[PDB]
């Protein structure tokens, strides 16, 4: 093959799900090539929207907007709640099933959280960092040394 | 053992300036494989290029004007009727 | 898919929410379906369809796929930076 996303089964699954038989191998290699590039493309765009929200854990709104800006159709139906399973299934393996269905009535009410209000304190009077108010103690010695580096004080 | 443990230990003879090793002084006085593999660098097949007719037309027009004035003879590509569908082509570069 | 996490690893983004891989895989499936569908139409077009003139036999070389993708990126897929225009 050429790259990731093995086209022997992935692209084969796609085409044989459509209802064809004759997809030459090199064609499916090139197809894997294209779809992987599109992945990196959308992924960088949603990163651009990620680091404006100044967060790290990319959410689905990032990629949804990243679609909306590529003049590309949106994608509905992916809620954060009701998490994922990826249940297994075997055939004489495929590792796919979704057993989260069979509802008849819902009558739940969402609970509102508090509004966004701010908590000032005092920190770093004239170089020294108090630990008495809402601050850390020397517990960053336990942090992961690539992260939160340096300490001079 | 430990050849770079300390500098070369020697003394210099004051008669002939030779560097002398200490033992010669008296006589002279007399898994991750897959991480390394995962460097795919995927590509697309085709890219668009936003280029209208007007910009390139004015450019090419003024170009061939000056080209016929100073010195086909312009700087042009060359594509074969066969084996096309590729993405970059050579150039004539005829002066 | 675990390989999707492996692909996430290329861009230093190890903070996903686990809905993204489902979603992007669904997306690529949709996209390639449309692609190799209209490429099959063009493979029919070379095979000269109407209300009964000939058969429909599939080969689907790479050129047809290239055609079916260039039409999509004719109105999609943020292209190379159009600097000179700007």
């Amino acid at each position: 093959s050429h790259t990731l996303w093995s086209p022997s089964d992935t692209v084969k699954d796609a085409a044989e799900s459509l209802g064809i038989f004759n997809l030459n191998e090199e064609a499916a290699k090139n197809l894997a090539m294209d779809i992987e590039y599109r992945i990196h493309e959308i992924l960088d765009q949603a990163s651009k929207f990620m680091r404006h929200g100044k967060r790290r854990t990319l959410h689905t709104s990032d990629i949804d907007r990243a679609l909306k800006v590529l003049n590309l159709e949106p994608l509905y139906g992916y809620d954060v709640s009701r998490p994922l399973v990826f249940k297994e299934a075997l055939v004489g393996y495929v590792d796919d099933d979704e057993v989260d269905f069979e509802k008849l009535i819902n009558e739940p009410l969402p609970k509102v959280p508090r509004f966004s209000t701010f908590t000032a304190h005092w920190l770093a009077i004239e170089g020294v960092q108090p630990a008495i108010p809402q601050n850390p103690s020397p517990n960053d010695i336990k942090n992961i040394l690539p992260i939160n580096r340096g300490s001079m004080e | 053992k430990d050849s770079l443990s300390n500098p070369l230990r020697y003394r210099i003879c004051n008669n002939c300036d030779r560097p002398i090793l200490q033992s010669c002084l008296s006589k002279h006085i007399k898994h991750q494989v897959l991480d390394g593999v995962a460097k795919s660098y995927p590509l697309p097949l085709e890219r668009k290029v936003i280029m209208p007719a007007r910009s390139r037309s004015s450019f090419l027009r003024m170009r061939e004007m000056f080209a016929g004035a100073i010195l086909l003879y312009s700087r042009t590509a060359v594509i074969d009727v066969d084996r096309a569908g590729d993405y970059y082509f050579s150039v004539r570069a005829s002066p | 898919v675990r390989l999707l996490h492996l692909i996430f690893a290329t861009q230093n983004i190890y903070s996903y929410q686990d809905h993204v891989p489902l979603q992007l895989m669904d997306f690529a499936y949709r996209y390639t379906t449309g692609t190799l569908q209209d490429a099959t139409i063009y493979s029919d077009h070379a095979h000269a369809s109407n209300a009964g003139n000939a058969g429909t036999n599939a080969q689907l070389t790479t050129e047809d796929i290239r055609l079916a993708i260039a039409a999509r990126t004719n109105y999609q897929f943020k292209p190379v930076p159009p600097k000179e225009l700007l």
Binding site: S6 | H31, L34, G36, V37, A38 | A9
Partner: peptide, 22 residues
């Protein structure tokens, strides 16, 4: 996670295909 992820990827028989795409 990275080491365990690569080990689980090797759990699949496609470790060979992954090894060839260098």
């Amino acid at each position: 996670y990275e080491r365990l992820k690569r080990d689980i990827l090797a759990l699949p028989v496609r470790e060979r295909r992954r090894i060839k795409a260098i």
